[PDB]
Amino acid sequence: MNWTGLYTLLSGVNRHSTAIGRVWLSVIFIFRIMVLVVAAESVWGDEKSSFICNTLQPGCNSVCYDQFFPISHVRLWSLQLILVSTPALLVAMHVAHQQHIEKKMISGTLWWTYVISVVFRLLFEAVFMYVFYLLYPGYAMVRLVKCDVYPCPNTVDCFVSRPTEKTVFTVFMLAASGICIILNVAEVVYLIIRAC
Amino acid sequence: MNWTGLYTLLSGVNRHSTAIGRVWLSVIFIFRIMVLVVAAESVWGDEKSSFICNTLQPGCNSVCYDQFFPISHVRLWSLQLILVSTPALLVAMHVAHQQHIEKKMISGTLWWTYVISVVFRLLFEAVFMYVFYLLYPGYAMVRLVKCDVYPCPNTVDCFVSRPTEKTVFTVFMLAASGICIILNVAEVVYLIIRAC
Numbered sequence: 001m002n003w004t005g006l007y008t009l010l011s012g013v014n015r016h017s018t019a020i021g022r023v024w025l026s027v028i029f030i031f032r033i034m035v036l037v038v039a040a041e042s043v044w045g046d047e048k049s050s051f052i053c054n055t056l057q058p059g060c061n062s063v064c065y066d067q068f069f070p071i072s073h074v075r076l077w078s079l080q081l082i083l084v085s086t087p088a089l090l091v092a093m094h095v096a097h098q099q100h101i102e103k104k105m106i107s108g109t110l111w112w113t114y115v116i117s118v119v120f121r122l123l124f125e126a127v128f129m130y131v132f133y134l135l136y137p138g139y140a141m142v143r144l145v146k147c148d149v150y151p152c153p154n155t156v157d158c159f160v161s162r163p164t165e166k167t168v169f170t171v172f173m174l175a176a177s178g179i180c181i182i183l184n185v186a187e188v189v190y191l192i193i194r195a196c
Numbered sequence: 197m198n199w200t201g202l203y204t205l206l207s208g209v210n211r212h213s214t215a216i217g218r219v220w221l222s223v224i225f226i227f228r229i230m231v232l233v234v235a236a237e238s239v240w241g242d243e244k245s246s247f248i249c250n251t252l253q254p255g256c257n258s259v260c261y262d263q264f265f266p267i268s269h270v271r272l273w274s275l276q277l278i279l280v281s282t283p284a285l286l287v288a289m290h291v292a293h294q295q296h297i298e299k300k301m302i303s304g305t306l307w308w309t310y311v312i313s314v315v316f317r318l319l320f321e322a323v324f325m326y327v328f329y330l331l332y333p334g335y336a337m338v339r340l341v342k343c344d345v346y347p348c349p350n351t352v353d354c355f356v357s358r359p360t361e362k363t364v365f366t367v368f369m370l371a372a373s374g375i376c377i378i379l380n381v382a383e384v385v386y387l388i389i390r391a392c
């Protein structure tokens with residue numbers, strides 16, 4: 001493994017991307033992947049097993065955990081990474097297919113599809129940011145929550161596992177997503193300006 | 197033990213009480229004593245040991261039981277019986293003392309002290325009825341209670357032991373107390389009418 005191969009793999013074979021999406025976006029993507037890898041198994045490993053409520057009612061822990069955590073942060077970020085990386089994979093596959101078909105026997109089409117893929121990537125980033133805002137208003141996570149879902153009688157106190165570490169990693173991931181959004185917008189603007 | 201001795205002991209040596217307070221009040225007193233004896237140990241024996249709340253908080257059962265049962269029905273009725281029987285004991289002791297002092301060496305004084313003792317007995321009956329009404333509004337007892345006393349978090353469901361049997365015995369004791377009140381009022385009225 002060399003640098004000239006890793007850089008080519010990350011950038012794809014596309015020849016229209018500038019240094020914003022070729023030197024900076026790949027680095028932020030690697031940063032997000034590494035943070036998700038080092039945080040998924042350790043911090044969020046026992047989010048449900050150590051989630052306890054102050055009640056004797058059977059089945060209250062599971063219903064309260066599902067009520068307060070419809071989909072955990074780790075899985076939300078994994079889905080966000082997959083959806084954000086899908087258009088880049090599509091562009092790389094399309095470039096490879098065009099190279100194959102020209103070998104066995106255009107620039108504007110590649111430029112347009114790259115612009116469309118960057119727009120879709122920005123749209124996915126914004127959609128996942130909005131979903132995270134809807135599900136979990138506020139970056140901070142609290143230690144104690146009040147759960148009144150059936151079958152829990154009245155309202156019970158349930159305790160979250162590692163609120164502070166999860167808050168730190170949430171801040172990191174949200175900052176990385178914001179940087180990605182800014183870089184995508186800058187890339188779109190630069191391409192439009194240079195094309196005109 | 198013969199009837200002519202039990203009747204004399206129950207009525208005392210007082211010669212002013214009519215058949216209302218000599219034949220009927222003693223029977224109702226015996227009825228109340230027997231009901232209290234057969235209900236105190238069995239029905240109310242495990243009122244606190246089997247009082248459970250739906251929570252994991254230590255010490256919530258005791259605080260909730262004390263909140264909802266400041267003083268149990270059995271002890272309230274025992275204190276009521278003792279206080280109601282105190283004036284009769286005082287009258288009997290006074291009659292015995294007068295007999296002793298006249299032997300070693302009046303009717304109006306005995307009549308007045310008997311009337312005063314009956315009035316005090318009626319007052320004690322009314323006071324204990326009012327106290328029971330204040331502490332436990334309504335004869336019926338519920339199975340489930342909502343307890344929000346410290347240290348219990350939020351509101352917890354606590355379960356009472358034998359609500360229906362305790363309701364039945366409460367009805368019996370309240371009916372007996374009402375009959376005693378009516379008989380005391382009738383005795384006072386009869387004495388006042390006959391004296392004038």
Ligand SMILES: CCCCCCCC/C=C\CCCCCCCC(=O)O[C@@H](COC(=O)CCCCCCCCCCCCCCC)COP(=O)([O-])OCC[N+](C)(C)C
Nearest residue numbers: 001002003004005006029030031032033034035036037038
């Ligand atoms: C997302 C998770 C990240 C975790 C943190 C990772 C951080 C650290 C991880 C990785 C850092 C890199 C480690 C190896 C570096 C040596 C490379 C090398 O010598 O290349 C040379 C030889 O190499 C080859 O020909 C084969 C290259 C294999 C490298 C390892 C493959 C993946 C290992 C997966 C491990 C799985 C377990 C990992 C954990 C699950 C290059 O070939 P060459 O013939 O010299 O080139 C031509 C010669 N010429 C130039 C003179 C003309």
Ligand SMILES: CCCCCCCC/C=C\CCCCCCCC(=O)O[C@@H](COC(=O)CCCCCCCCCCCCCCC)COP(=O)([O-])OCC[N+](C)(C)C
Nearest residue numbers: 197198199200201202225226227228229230231232233234
């Ligand atoms: C509040 C709780 C209530 C519970 C329900 C109770 C229901 C049932 C209970 C009780 C009913 C009565 C049982 C005994 C009746 C026999 C009486 C008798 O024969 O008397 C005779 C003899 O007797 C005596 O001389 C002594 C009397 C002792 C009686 C028992 C004393 C208390 C027992 C306590 C027990 C403790 C355990 C109880 C449970 C804790 C009378 O004497 P005599 O010499 O014949 O008289 C003169 C002779 N002449 C007439 C010919 C001139």
Ligand SMILES: CC(C)CCC[C@@H](C)[C@H]1CC[C@H]2[C@@H]3CC=C4C[C@@H](O)CC[C@]4(C)[C@H]3CC[C@]12C
Nearest residue numbers: 009010011021022025026029084085086088089
């Ligand atoms: C500018 C940034 C966004 C470019 C990022 C490039 C990403 C989307 C590309 C570069 C290399 C790609 C990987 C290359 C090889 C494989 C192995 C295959 O069995 C599953 C997909 C997987 C794991 C690809 C996933 C997508 C991937 C990680």
Ligand SMILES: CC(C)CCC[C@@H](C)[C@H]1CC[C@H]2[C@@H]3CC=C4C[C@@H](O)CC[C@]4(C)[C@H]3CC[C@]12C
Nearest residue numbers: 205206207217218221222225280281282284285
């Ligand atoms: C008209 C009605 C209210 C009269 C009722 C009479 C009551 C008050 C009298 C009759 C016999 C009495 C009992 C006779 C003997 C004793 C034994 C003594 O060591 C304690 C008190 C005790 C237990 C007395 C308590 C009061 C008593 C039960």
